[PDB]
Symmetry: C3
Subunit: 283 residues, 3 copies
């Protein structure tokens, strides 16, 4: 199924009819960071498998629902079950849910992920406001926009200079300051490692040379599709480990250690994002 | 359709029969730089859609003709309508037109493109003679030659040390000197960004660290297919913007600004290439 | 055919029945380095084309046999005919032979390749014990593990910190010292260039900046599949040329010069690996 206008329109029309929610804000959560989606009020849960033209996720399995409702006095739509390109999803499959969000009325997309620290100062448990990225798949002819352009959604050649909205970054930091946890909050450049192997020790060392602060396997494709269709983005990485120190010390990373850090910060991150939502422009 | 010997041969035979031109020189023009193709004398225009085994371009649309005839006293063939890999064309589709040029008798291929400046000295409107490249798709398993080798055209493992012919570079510079515009002409390494998003600000900064002078989304695949089958190449980038300064100053790029720079230099570039053609070896 | 548990199991069962060999050690040889496979005692030769679910290699052609038997008092299985991703093989095709080795009982995989020197000290004819890698295809969404994970073989997110077993490196070096050729043996980081064009001169220069010691077009995919399923790896590059010096001096590489270096060192490399096999743990 192509992520085109007719196909996204049919998905959006089904979602509107079933939910009776018109959302202004979209949310995509990293692994183990899904608590916010559980605090959604008057929730409507729509399985991906019921939505016309939505991508098939049963090979990967695990949950796949759109959840719509209210949080922090605002109407939102959340992806419960994220699509990652290391699973083998096509550009069309990644793009279609975000384009449906655009047609549902989403103007701001909030994204979290778990990532490895490349800046030597970053500690496990820190938050990084992403201010820019290095898209290795994009440089290498695997950009999520490769293929015919869908002109109905955006231009052939997007500029990504404002992909990570500066005012949303400033708002997120302001709220951390008001709540006295700004000592956890950094800003940084995210390197997109297609995955699914963790960055090798020598890859980490290369990324340090190239100016990256964090590394992960997600987020950049959604950011690009959102930027292409005019949706503002705030993206926040939770640091699971410091990959540069691990490289220098011969220490391994594993998904279990990673999920343990998400458990440590999930509630704070939920409280932070709920307050961001309440403080977003009504426009 | 594979870009193999039988299939390229059938395309070449059709082109020869219809045009009655045997060309020595091939031309592929960047966006907005197609004026030379309009100065071709005794022209024969052959729509791609009429040529056996030529790639289908109707999803992207826009013009797709081979134009054969005389320029500057020489027989040439030009691609009016270029195939870019960010459109989703396969390796076989990119390779087939250049291999047909080889069978038509092309010995030299002249290419122009629009590109972003990474060297801080490069100004909008400057020309860069390309002397080498950094092929990010190639390093990342998206090289245009991935797949079975077509032994009839060239070796399994091409060396690209002389991909950009030194004597053609020297000839191009000599002509710029004779016409007193050498102050516009630089030489440089081209970084191939698969596209279609413009290089992000942090990507630009990375390319500066890695020794690149310019960045763009084209040219390198054609250069590799031409080098593989023994066709000499001259490739010239027109600088549309300085991406490193834009990154440092938070300024966006857009395709419209880009096409405005092509309009500014198109006539000079046409005059330059016409004189290059007239001055090429008869061999 | 997917490289899944049922399909690898059917291949392994056929191989066991036909060979009557249960191997502990696997061997994959670089081009022109296949002499060891000729010293295998009580050999059983099984054409890839006879093995259920094995990948089709007739488009590339050339030899494709599994050879099982004894070397150095140990039971081994060797791939006579290697699958390279620049040929266009899918992730599933690359992964399946290594996963069959796992099911046959392989605990250690020995790999050789021919590679270009990026460290300025490396000479043609030197050996490099690989201690780490920079996986450009992996960073760029062409990792050999992209696709659904096969949970029966290994985790969704492998860590590669110990991908190149340290004790095997130490054993290989010890044996070189005992035989007084340690002056040929270096250790280094391998950059995986998807290929099949050789690294361009400016690509070589970039790799030098990024900390790479050698560059080649193989090995890293097999290492990742082996690491994923718990097989220990020793990988040794034979330096065919110094690519950084060639870049600095405008000298070309060609496959013929490369095969001439393999001929020069093939017998020593065979003797070295035979002694490594004899000295491996019985566990």
């Amino acid at each position: 199924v192509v992520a085109n206008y007719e196909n996204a329109s049919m998905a959006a029309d089904y979602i509107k009819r079933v939910s009776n929610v018109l959302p202004d804000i979209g949310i995509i959560c990293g692994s183990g960071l899904g608590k916010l989606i559980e605090e959604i009020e008057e929730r409507k849960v729509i399985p991906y498998i019921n939505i016309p033209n939505f991508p098939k996720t049963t090979v990967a399995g695990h949950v796949g629902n759109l959840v719509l409702g209210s949080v922090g006095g605002r109407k939102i739509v959340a992806m419960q079950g994220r699509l990652h390109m290391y699973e083998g999803y096509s550009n069309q499959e990644i793009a279609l849910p975000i384009r449906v969000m655009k047609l549902l009325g989403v103007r701001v997309l909030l994204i979290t992920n778990l990532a490895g620290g490349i800046n030597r100062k970053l500690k496990s448990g820190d938050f990084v406001l992403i201010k820019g990225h290095i898209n290795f798949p994009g440089l290498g002819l695997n950009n999520v926009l490769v293929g015919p352009n869908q002109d109905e959604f955006g231009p052939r050649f997007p500029d990504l200079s404002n992909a990570y909205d500066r005012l949303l970054q400033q708002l997120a930091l302001k709220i951390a300051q008001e709540n006295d946890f700004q000592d956890l909050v950094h800003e940084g450049v995210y390197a997109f490692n297609g995955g699914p192997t963790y960055e090798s020790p020598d890859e980490s060392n290369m990324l340090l040379k190239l100016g990256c602060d964090v590394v992960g396997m997600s987020t950049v494709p959604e950011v690009i599709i959102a930027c292409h269709c005019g949706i503002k983005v705030l993206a926040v990485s939770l640091i699971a480990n410091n990959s540069i120190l691990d490289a220098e010390n011969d220490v391994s990373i594993n998904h279990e250690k990673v999920l343990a850090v998400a458990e440590k910060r999930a509630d704070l991150l939920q409280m932070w994002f709920k307050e961001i939502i309440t403080r977003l422009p009504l426009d």
